[PDB]
Structure formats: C-alpha cells, structure tokens
Design a protein around this ligand. Structure first.
Ligand SMILES: [Cl-]
Ligand SMILES: [Cl-]
Ligand SMILES: [Cl-]
Ligand SMILES: [Cl-]
Ligand SMILES: [Cl-]
Ligand SMILES: [Cl-]
Ligand SMILES: [Cl-]
Ligand SMILES: [Cl-]
Ligand SMILES: [Cl-]
Ligand SMILES: [Cl-]
Ligand SMILES: [Cl-]
Ligand SMILES: [Cl-]
Lengths: 60, 60, 60, 60
C-alpha cells in the first residue's frame, strides 16, 4: 500500500520536473526567436533604405 | 481503491501528454533556429565577399 | 605659328585622355553600384521570407 | 587667325566642362560606395554577433 503511493509520487515528480525543464527551454528558444524577429525587421528596413539611396544615386 | 488508481492514471496521462506537446514544440523551434543558423552563415559569407569586391573597386 | 598649333594639340590630347580615364572609372563604379543593387534586392527578399517563416513558427 | 583661336578656346572649354562633370559624378558615386562599405561592415559584425548568440542558445 505505502510503497505503491510512494512510487507513484516519484513518477509524478519525474514527469513534473521534466515538464518544467521543457517549459524553461521552450521559453528560452522562444525569446531567442523574438530577438531574431526584431533584428530581421530592422535589417529589412535598413537595406530597403540603402537601396532607395543607391537608386537615387544611380538615377541622378 | 479503484477510483484512486484511475485518478492517478489520468494524472499521469495528463502530464505525459503535456510533456509530449512541449517536446514537439521545442523540436519545431529548434529546427527553425537551425535554419536561422545556416541562413546567417550564408549571408555573412556573401556580405564579406561583396565587401572584398567593393574594396577592390575602391582601391583600383 | 607651328609651335602654337602643336602645343594646342597636346593640350587637347591631355584633356581628351583625362576625360576618357574618368569615363572608364565612372563606368566601373557604376557597374559595381548595379551589382550592389541586385544583391540588396535579393537580400531584402530573402530576409522578408525568413521573417514570414519565423512568424509562422512564432504563431503556431 | 582670330576665328581659329576662338574655336580652339571653345573646344578647350568643352572638354574642360565635360571633364569637371565626370569628376563630380565620380566623386558622388565614390562617396556612395564608401557609405556601402561602412554599412556592409556594420551588418557583417551584427550578423556574426547574432550567430554567436544563436549558437549559445543552441548549445545550452
Ligand atoms: Cl502537478
Ligand atoms: Cl527532456
Ligand atoms: Cl508548475
Ligand atoms: Cl511514462
Ligand atoms: Cl503547456
Ligand atoms: Cl514517449
Ligand atoms: Cl575630341
Ligand atoms: Cl583625373
Ligand atoms: Cl572618344
Ligand atoms: Cl585647363
Ligand atoms: Cl559625359
Ligand atoms: Cl579645374
């Protein structure tokens, strides 16, 4: 009786901890992806500007 | 007796499924990050080349 | 009489050659700028795509 | 006599002005190329950094 309860408690703690670990890692990679989003946006804007200027120079 | 076992089985199935879901999502975001790695590498190489040529033109 | 004509011919040849040189250099730098145009265009398209995918991954 | 001198003066003024024009345009395109140099340098540095961080996230 007691041993069954104990074993089950340890199984629950195992899955719980593995789940918290995956949660944390997923938060980390999600943050990194957000950073990549911002950076990509900035770079796109900057290259589009540089292209505009480049074309003003090519036209004139 | 029986109801306790059943309830515990449902708890285990819950944590199990949530864990599999986090596993899958984490695999997805990891793959995306790998893609970003490759792409960043390529872009770095290409810009360094374009710079080299740009500097040959500026020197000559 | 003769020396004046000769001197003037050499002046004309000087300005002519300097002008041809500037013409050639300007063609070179213009070609390089065109290359930069194409490259910038490609890079803009590629980064916009990578952003689209990144956002599909962030949304799902 | 006089007309020959005048005509030659106009030829010299023509080549002179065309030469000054090519000089100015070449300065413009050279400045633009310098801007492109700086920008390319910055972008290379930034992408290399973003790659470093991306790889720290992938390693941990
Ligand atoms: Cl729990
Ligand atoms: Cl795990
Ligand atoms: Cl929790
Ligand atoms: Cl299990
Ligand atoms: Cl979840
Ligand atoms: Cl499994
Ligand atoms: Cl001529
Ligand atoms: Cl010159
Ligand atoms: Cl000619
Ligand atoms: Cl002169
Ligand atoms: Cl011209
Ligand atoms: Cl002058």
């Amino acid at each position: 009786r007691r041993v069954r309860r104990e074993r089950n408690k340890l199984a629950a703690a195992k899955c719980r901890n593995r789940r918290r670990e995956l949660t944390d890692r997923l938060q980390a990679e999600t943050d990194q992806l957000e950073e990549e989003k911002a950076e990509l946006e900035s770079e796109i804007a900057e290259l589009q500007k540089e292209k505009e200027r480049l074309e003003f120079v090519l036209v004139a």
